Design an enzyme around this catalytic site. Structure first.
Site, PDB file in Angstrom:
ATOM      1  N   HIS A  61       0.839  -1.223   0.000  1.00  0.00           N
ATOM      2  CA  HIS A  61       0.000   0.000   0.000  1.00  0.00           C
ATOM      3  C   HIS A  61       0.865   1.262   0.000  1.00  0.00           C
ATOM      4  CE1 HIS A  61      -2.174  -3.289   2.160  1.00  0.00           C
ATOM      5  NE2 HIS A  61      -2.981  -3.041   1.139  1.00  0.00           N
ATOM      6  N   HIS A  91       5.469   6.897   6.792  1.00  0.00           N
ATOM      7  CA  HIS A  91       5.208   6.528   5.406  1.00  0.00           C
ATOM      8  C   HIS A  91       4.613   7.720   4.720  1.00  0.00           C
ATOM      9  CE1 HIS A  91       1.449   6.072   7.616  1.00  0.00           C
ATOM     10  NE2 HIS A  91       0.850   6.469   6.471  1.00  0.00           N
ATOM     11  N   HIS A  93       1.830   9.113   1.402  1.00  0.00           N
ATOM     12  CA  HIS A  93       0.822   8.899   0.362  1.00  0.00           C
ATOM     13  C   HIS A  93       1.120   9.879  -0.754  1.00  0.00           C
ATOM     14  CE1 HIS A  93      -1.748   6.832   3.421  1.00  0.00           C
ATOM     15  NE2 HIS A  93      -1.021   7.579   4.207  1.00  0.00           N
ATOM     16  N   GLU A 103      -3.626  13.344   1.451  1.00  0.00           N
ATOM     17  CA  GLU A 103      -4.900  12.850   2.038  1.00  0.00           C
ATOM     18  C   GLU A 103      -5.652  14.020   2.630  1.00  0.00           C
ATOM     19  OE1 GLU A 103      -3.759   9.294   4.379  1.00  0.00           O
ATOM     20  OE2 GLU A 103      -4.634   8.372   2.557  1.00  0.00           O
ATOM     21  N   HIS A 116       3.305  10.860   6.879  1.00  0.00           N
ATOM     22  CA  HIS A 116       2.676  10.548   8.189  1.00  0.00           C
ATOM     23  C   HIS A 116       3.693   9.917   9.075  1.00  0.00           C
ATOM     24  CE1 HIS A 116      -1.506  10.356   6.135  1.00  0.00           C
ATOM     25  NE2 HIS A 116      -1.082  11.593   6.410  1.00  0.00           N
ATOM     26  N   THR A 195      -6.137   6.372   8.117  1.00  0.00           N
ATOM     27  CA  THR A 195      -6.685   6.594   6.738  1.00  0.00           C
ATOM     28  C   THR A 195      -6.642   5.356   5.918  1.00  0.00           C
ATOM     29  OG1 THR A 195      -4.607   7.228   5.809  1.00  0.00           O
ATOM     30  CG2 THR A 195      -5.919   8.983   6.833  1.00  0.00           C
ATOM     31  N   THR A 196      -6.131   4.259   6.466  1.00  0.00           N
ATOM     32  CA  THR A 196      -6.118   2.973   5.765  1.00  0.00           C
ATOM     33  C   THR A 196      -6.897   2.003   6.625  1.00  0.00           C
ATOM     34  OG1 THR A 196      -4.077   2.503   6.941  1.00  0.00           O
ATOM     35  CG2 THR A 196      -3.905   3.297   4.673  1.00  0.00           C
TER      36      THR A 196
END
Ligand SMILES: NS(=O)(=O)c1cc(C(=O)CSc2nc3cnc4ccccc4c3[nH]2)ccc1Cl
Ligand SMILES: [Zn+2]
EC number: 4.2.1.1
Length: 257
Positions: A61, A91, A93, A103, A116, A195-196
């Site tokens: 992901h 990590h 996004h 995000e 994040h 958020t995941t």
């Protein structure tokens, strides 16, 4: 099963994870004009001097840079937080294009990417118990815009070719996450969620106002990663962001202005 495609992306997650339609889901749009300045909010305390990075992992992901969180070595405190939160991983996004990838949004603006830094509340002993608590995690979110390179990012970018596909990891010691922080620690904060999946409602979000810039070459290397495992059809790891969710009965607070 879940991911970021037409068939298993964010709009599908609610079937496996019903709280996706919950009361404190993340990310959100940060309306800067209706964020309330809170003069009682404290400066954030980021204490990353003794951080011990261990490993970088493509989890299918995103990629996580993981830390030793078995002592108070890289901790977040102050700010809106009570008590002490230990860094476990960071990590990002990011998008398929520079115009998308974050995000959180700011007055509907999308950044190219968002970092994040995930921390868990030490009162709960470990990450797995923390995520079952409403104040279990504190995530420091930092926007990335494309411009001048971030020299402190380059070590991360350069190891990505060794973790191209899902499930690959590489040793990743001596990485200093202070090199990923902008000059200002002014922030917005609100209660939200992962958020995941599993989208647990356990996060105090602390989103810095000042983005860091990264170069077009650095973000291009993010986009060469793969969501697939080795020996599977290549699907580029891009657009691994969840869109803004309804703010519902929440107030975003500002530490500034
Ligand atoms: N995007 S985010 O909200 O900062 C965020 C992302 C993530 C990841 O996606 C790391 S990969 C990851 N895989 C899993 C599988 N199960 C989990 C069960 C509970 C909690 C986490 C879990 C998890 N995290 C982990 C924590 C946070 Cl706070
Ligand atoms: Zn994240």
């Amino acid at each position: 099963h879940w991911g970021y495609g037409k068939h298993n992306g964010p709009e599908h997650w609610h079937k496996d994870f019903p709280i996706a339609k919950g009361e404190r889901q993340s990310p959100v749009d940060i309306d800067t004009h209706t964020a309330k300045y809170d003069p009682s909010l404290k400066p954030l305390s980021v204490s990353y001097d003794q951080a011990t990075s261990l490993r970088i992992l493509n989890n299918g992901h995103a990629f996580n840079v993981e830390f030793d969180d078995s002592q108070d070595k890289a901790v977040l405190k102050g700010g809106p937080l009570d008590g002490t939160y230990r860094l476990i991983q960071f990590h990002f996004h990011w998008g398929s294009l520079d115009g998308q990838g974050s995000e959180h949004t700011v007055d509907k603006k999308k950044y190219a990417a968002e970092l994040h830094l995930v921390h868990w509340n030490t009162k709960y002993g470990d990450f797995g118990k923390a995520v079952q608590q409403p104040d279990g995690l504190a995530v420091l979110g930092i926007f990335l815009k494309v411009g001048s390179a971030k020299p402190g990012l380059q070590k991360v970018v350069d190891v990505l070719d060794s973790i191209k596909t899902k499930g690959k990891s590489a040793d990743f010691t001596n990485f200093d996450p202070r090199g990923l922080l902008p000059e200002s620690l002014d922030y917005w904060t609100y209660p939200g969620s992962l958020t995941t999946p599993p989208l647990l409602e356990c996060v105090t979000w602390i989103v810095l106002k000042e983005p860091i810039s990264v170069s077009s070459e650095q973000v291009l290397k993010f986009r060469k990663l793969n969501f697939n495992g080795e020996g599977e059809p290549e699907e580029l790891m891009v657009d691994n962001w969840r869109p803004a969710q309804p703010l519902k009965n929440r107030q975003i607070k500002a530490s500034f202005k």
